[PDB]
Amino acid sequence: LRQRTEELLRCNEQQAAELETCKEQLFQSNMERKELHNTVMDLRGNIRVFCRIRPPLESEENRMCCTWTYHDESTVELQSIDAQAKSKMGQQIFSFDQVFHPLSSQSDIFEMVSPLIQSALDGYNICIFAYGQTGSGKTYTMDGVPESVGVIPRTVDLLFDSIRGYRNLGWEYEIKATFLEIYNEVLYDLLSNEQKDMEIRMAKNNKNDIYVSNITEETVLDPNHLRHLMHTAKMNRATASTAGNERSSRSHAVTKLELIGRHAEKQEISVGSINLVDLAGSESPNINRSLSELTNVILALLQKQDHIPYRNSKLTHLLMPSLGGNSKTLMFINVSPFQDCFQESVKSLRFAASVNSC
Amino acid sequence: LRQRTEELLRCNEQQAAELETCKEQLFQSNMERKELHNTVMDLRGNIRVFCRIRPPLESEENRMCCTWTYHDESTVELQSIDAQAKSKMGQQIFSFDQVFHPLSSQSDIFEMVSPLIQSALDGYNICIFAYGQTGSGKTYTMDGVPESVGVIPRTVDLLFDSIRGYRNLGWEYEIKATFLEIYNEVLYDLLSNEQKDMEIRMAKNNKNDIYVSNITEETVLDPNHLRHLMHTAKMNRATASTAGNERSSRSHAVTKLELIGRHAEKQEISVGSINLVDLAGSESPNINRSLSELTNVILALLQKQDHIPYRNSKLTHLLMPSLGGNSKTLMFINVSPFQDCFQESVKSLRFAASVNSC
Ligand SMILES: Nc1ncnc2c1ncn2[C@@H]1O[C@H](COP(=O)(O)OP(=O)(O)O)[C@@H](O)[C@H]1O
Ligand SMILES: Nc1ncnc2c1ncn2[C@@H]1O[C@H](COP(=O)(O)OP(=O)(O)O)[C@@H](O)[C@H]1O
């Protein structure tokens, strides 16, 4: 039992010596996987713009829509039904990275976002924006409805799903969540009922970063806890669905999910983040500096401008660290199919016309 | 030593139970890595075309060159020094996936090929072509010279280098090498000195594949053995560097490296292949059916044509299984900088003009 059981001895020596191999092999693999995913993201865009035309609700059966033409997968055209105007404006055709048909599904739209969730997990900053005139589809796209949840809820589910997988690869993740609203260039903490003076200040240990004073920050326990935090904030956003839409339809909602990945037994951390934004309505009548300046910032980033004026508004200043270089931005342009919206519609599609144009 | 050494007992049980985990984890990783690499390849092209202008040799110090302009990294322009002609043809400007300046290095050109070597290892078929008029740079690009080796030698080194890494991931690779020459629509086995009737026939167990009768096939032992097989074939290609260039400058050299990856303890094989081709000179005076038909095939593949006439020539028929769908093609357009070559030069760059044009 000495010169007989030595077989069940160095066996561990050979075993453990083979485990460490695989381990370092797997870690280097992930490394290469991560880098390839980013090359794909970089190749696909980094700042992409999608178009989404929503279908008419049941209660709008009698609301006239203009004529829509879907050219392939990324070009859409619309023509006023006003024969007078139509023959005085000429073709209204626009292209985007992708055009989502009114019959497209919520799942259809997440297929475009999910790859970016992985990026956040790899340490990249992501920004998802929903743009458009009040009633175009912004909130339905980000939040969705019970029988058809949108981006945010799908992000939570996928996020905790990937964090699980990461467990068997070393790496443990913590999610820090904040929820805020910007209305008239003033910030509001959607997780508190006691408002304080919230300001966007220069991070203490990084002149290039930022932090918001007096915002509630919760480190998420699990999916349900985040679902609750989200429902709480949605309920506190109390966007005037009753009276005075001048504050609901005129304010931005920003949800930030800071993702911190830690890997003990190999040191090194990984800090990423997901910024989901339900923007203020873009229709025409400060109250909309942030949205105006956000438009400038995005277009500027697209024109590879040497100097971007982020501090120009509350919203751009808040997302500055997530609009950087390696940062990835996804901008959904929500649009209504109604003729009485035509004017506001080309205005929205024209933004995307300033995008691909550069 | 029974209820005391049980610690060095189930330890292996826990150990081995943890190794299998990592293993399956690593295999699935590679899987994802492989798929990402292919999405990158697909996004970059699949059939790309590069341009390479060689510098004048020392013994050509007095050979007049036309004027060359390098626009960014992928657009080149040339203007005849004949003032009469220049003002009668208009701009000669072309774009490629990448333009290699006459000062570019052999390393510079391999950076474009190496990613494709990985693809072959992942089970994809790759084709590398060197195109151009006699003296433009074809052979120097593929073979190179002692102090500056080209593509082929770099492919061998990188190939055996990656095969080594694969060892610690399961997967064992065998390399099957063949070397042939096509001159007047006749095949020649470059590893034998006893010529037989070599024909391109329909593979026995796959109406869509092919095989060449009577070609020497060697399963490579190691890098040196392949280096030898290559030097043997290069020496047998005896391309008329003496007299009658009408057979050296008029024939194609094709080197195929069939890569078979086997993974015991997970079954499943992986068959890929690398086809390195030194084409026949494209200058003007059958003797060049293969090169003419190869041009048609490539352009057709680019135009996503429903039916490609591969059997139209010996060379296209031989590469048919490696010009398929998932197949990746890289075509280098070798070009001389001399004024006395101007005519043949736009002819070469114009091929690439039919490429990006579609
Ligand atoms: N794609 C769609 N499919 C079905 N209903 C939609 C769709 N898009 C929007 N809606 C509907 O209209 C409302 C969504 O508001 P939204 O247009 O997102 O806001 P705003 O444009 O003011 O930001 C929901 O009640 C929803 O039923
Ligand atoms: N990039 C280069 N740098 C230095 N010398 C070159 C270069 N390209 C071609 N050459 C030279 O000219 C010869 C190569 O032949 P090549 O032009 O490849 O053949 P063909 O165009 O007839 O297929 C070599 O002897 C080499 O010295």
Q: What does this protein structure show overall?
A:
Chain A has 358 residues and is of the alpha/beta class. The first copy, chain A, has a single domain (1-358), classed as 3-Layer(aba) Sandwich (Kinesin). The first copy, chain A, has helices at 10-44, 83-86, 106-110, 114-121, 138-142, 151-167, 223-236, 289-302, 314-319, 342-355, and strands at residues 47-53, 67-71, 75-79, 93-95, 98-100, 125-131, 144-145, 148-149, 172-182, 187-189, 200-202, 210-212, 218-220, 252-262, 269-278, 328-335. The termini of chain A are far apart. At the A-B interface, helix 1 of A face helix 1 of B. Bound molecules: adenosine-5'-diphosphate (2 copies). Residues 54-55, 57, 132, 134-140, 145, 249, 281, 334 of chain A line the site of one adenosine-5'-diphosphate. Chains A, B: Its EC number is 3.6.4.-. Chains A, B: Keywords: ATP-binding, Cell cycle, Cell division, Coiled coil, Cytoplasm, Cytoskeleton, Hydrolase, Meiosis, Microtubule, Mitosis, Motor protein, Nucleotide-binding, Phosphoprotein.
Bound molecules: adenosine-5'-diphosphate
Can you say what the CATH homologous superfamily of chain A is?
A: Kinesin motor domain
CATH architecture field of chain A: 3-Layer(aba) Sandwich
Tell me what portion of residues of chain A adopts beta-strand conformation. Answer: 15-25%
**Largest sheet of chain A, if any?**
9 strands, mixed
- What is the overall silhouette of chain A? globular
The CATH class of chain A is identified as Alpha Beta
Radius of gyration of chain A: 24 Å
Percent helix range of chain A: 25-40%
* CATH fold descriptor of chain A: Kinesin
Structural class designation of chain A: alpha/beta
Multimeric status of the protein: homodimer
How many structural domains of chain A?
A: 1
Major interchain interface with per-chain residue totals: A-B, 28 and 28 residues
Give the tally of β-strands of chain A.
16
- Helices of chain A, by number, come to 10
Span between N and C termini of chain A? 77 Å
- H and E order of chain A: HEEEHEEHHEHEEHEEEEEHEEHHEH
PDB class: contractile protein
Keywords: kinesin, microtubule-based motor, NCD, contractile protein
Assembly: dimeric
Entry title: NCD (non-claret disjunctional) dimer from D. melanogaster
